[PDB]
Amino acid sequence: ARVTVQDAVEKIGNRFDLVLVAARRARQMQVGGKDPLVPEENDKTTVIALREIEEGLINNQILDVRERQEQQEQEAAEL
C-alpha cells in the first residue's frame, strides 16, 4: 500500500500539483495510452502513478514531452 506519500511532495513542490501529475499519469494508465515505468505490486492505477512520482521518472515536465512526442508520432503516421 501507500502509507506516507511524503517521498512524492519531497520531489515535486506545492503538494497539490503532485495530485495533478499523479492523476494525469494515472489517467494515461487507467485509460491505456502507456504502461507503468515501475513494476505493479497489484496496487491500483492510483498507487503506481505515485510510485513513478517517487522514482522521479514521471512528473509534470516529462509528461509534456511524452504527449508532444506522441503527437509528432501521429503526424509521422503517413506510412
Binding site: R15, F16, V19, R27, Q30, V31
Partner: protein, 247 residues
C-alpha cells in the same frame, strides 16, 4: 465475563461502580459457597446456621433474622434461590460501608482488597499486581448497531430538489454539512468537494453520466451545474426580482 478499563473510574469520579463490584464479589461469594454447601447436599441444619450467619453480619441493623418460621421445609427454597447469588439491599444513603463489605467478604473466602490473581489465557503466565474483580450489574440500552448502521450507493432522490433522502435511515445517505465543506476547504481537496456537491448528489445528469463511467472503469466526471441552484433561480424569479446568467 467482562473486562473493563480501570482508568475510567478515577476520571469520571464515579466510585459507586467500584463498590457495587466489591460488594458483588462478596454477594456472589456467599452464593458460590451456598451452592457448594448444597452441592454436597448437607443436612437442613448446617445450611440453616450458615444462612443465620449470612443475614447477621456486622453489629446492628435492621436484620430481623431467620428461624422465625419453620427452618426445614419452609426455608429450604431460600437456598435454591441463593445458590446463584445473594440478593442484597443497599439503600441510598443508608447503604453498606467499608468494614461492612470487608466483613461480608470474610464470610465465604475473599481478600479485603477485593482483588485476586489472574492468568492470561493466551499465555498461561501471571499478571503482575492484583486485579479488581467482582460482579457488576450491566445494562443493555437500545442503541443496537443493527438498527443504526447504514449504507447508500444510489437510492431514490428528492423530487423538488434532486437530492438524497431523509437520513441514515432509509433510503438516504449522510448529510455532508457546511462544516464538512469547511474541512474540505482547509485541505487542498478540490475535486473531492466538487464531486461531493455535484456528481454524488445534487446534479441531475452528472450522477447518471458518472454511473455509466464507474462501471466502465474510467473514473472521471462531467460535473455540470447543481440542480437545486437552478431551483433557487426560479424561486427568486417568482418574486419581482430577475436573476440571469451572463457572459
Amino acid at each position: 465475563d467482562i473486562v473493563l478499563n480501570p482508568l475510567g473510574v478515577p476520571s469520571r469520579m464515579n466510585i459507586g461502580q467500584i463498590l457495587e463490584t466489591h460488594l458483588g464479589m462478596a454477594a456472589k461469594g456467599i452464593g458460590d459457597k451456598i451452592n457448594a454447601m448444597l452441592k454436597q447436599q448437607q443436612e437442613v441444619a448446617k445450611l440453616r446456621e450458615f444462612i443465620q450467619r449470612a443475614y447477621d453480619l456486622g453489629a446492628d441493623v435492621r436484620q430481623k433474622v431467620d428461624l422465625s418460621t419453620f427452618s426445614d421445609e419452609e426455608v429450604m427454597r431460600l437456598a435454591e434461590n441463593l445458590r446463584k447469588g445473594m440478593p442484597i439491599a443497599t439503600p441510598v444513603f443508608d447503604g453498606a460501608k467499608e468494614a461492612e463489605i470487608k466483613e461480608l467478604l470474610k464470610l465465604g473466602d475473599l481478600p479485603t482488597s477485593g482483588q485476586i490473581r489472574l492468568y492470561d489465557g493466551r499465555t498461561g503466565e501471571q499478571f503482575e499486581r492484583p486485579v479488581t474483580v467482582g460482579y457488576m450489574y450491566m445494562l443493555k440500552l437500545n442503541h443496537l448497531v443493527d438498527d443504526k448502521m447504514h449504507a447508500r450507493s444510489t437510492g431514490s432522490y428528492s423530487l423538488v430538489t434532486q437530492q438524497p433522502l431523509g437520513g441514515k435511515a432509509q433510503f438516504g445517505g449522510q448529510r455532508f454539512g457546511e462544516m464538512e465543506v469547511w474541512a474540505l476547504e482547509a485541505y487542498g481537496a478540490a475535486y473531492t468537494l466538487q464531486e461531493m456537491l455535484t456528481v454524488k448528489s445534487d446534479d441531475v445528469n452528472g450522477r447518471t453520466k458518472m454511473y455509466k463511467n464507474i462501471v466502465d472503469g474510467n473514473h472521471q466526471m462531467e460535473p455540470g451545474m447543481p440542480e437545486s441552484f437552478n431551483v433557487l433561480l426560479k424561486e427568486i424569479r417568482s418574486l419581482g426580482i430577475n436573476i440571469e446568467l451572463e457572459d
